């Protein structure tokens, strides 16, 4: 497909792209509680989230694409430390402006966030 609901691409094809500095399987978590097997792909300036299309092996929606420069907070839950929340927007001395929030349950929470954090800086 070119679009199913969003843009459809081939997960492998993307993983091997030169831009890709990192890659992390996970599941996006919705407020509704549903979870969606995905792959966070990290570049030197962006972080994509490819949502696996179950019925079409090896294909994913391009579910989102955020600029590392727009990441302001990254938290893990205490009760469940592999549940990583990403908070996007603007940050200054007075406080924080939250424009978007993505939540992923990430297998190697520690390694992943450390990789992303290293990119962010």
């Amino acid at each position: 497909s070119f679009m199913d609901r969003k843009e459809v691409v081939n997960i492998q094809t993307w993983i091997n792209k030169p831009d890709i500095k990192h890659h992390f399987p996970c599941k996006e978590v919705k407020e509704s509680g549903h979870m969606f097997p995905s792959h966070l792909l990290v570049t030197a300036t962006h972080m994509y989230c490819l949502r696996e299309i179950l019925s079409r092996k090896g294909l994913a929606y391009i579910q989102s694409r955020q600029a590392l420069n727009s990441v302001v907070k990254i938290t893990s839950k205490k009760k469940h430390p592999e549940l990583i929340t990403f908070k996007y927007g603007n940050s200054s001395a007075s406080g924080i402006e939250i424009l978007a929030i993505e939540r992923y349950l990430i297998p190697n929470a520690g390694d992943a966030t450390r990789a992303i954090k290293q990119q962010i800086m």
Binding site: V71, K73, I74, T75, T85, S91
Partner: peptide, 12 residues
């Protein structure tokens, strides 16, 4: 309740 892992302006 959560743990800050990164917070732009503060944890660098």
């Amino acid at each position: 309740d959560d743990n800050t892992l990164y917070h732009r302006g503060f944890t660098e």
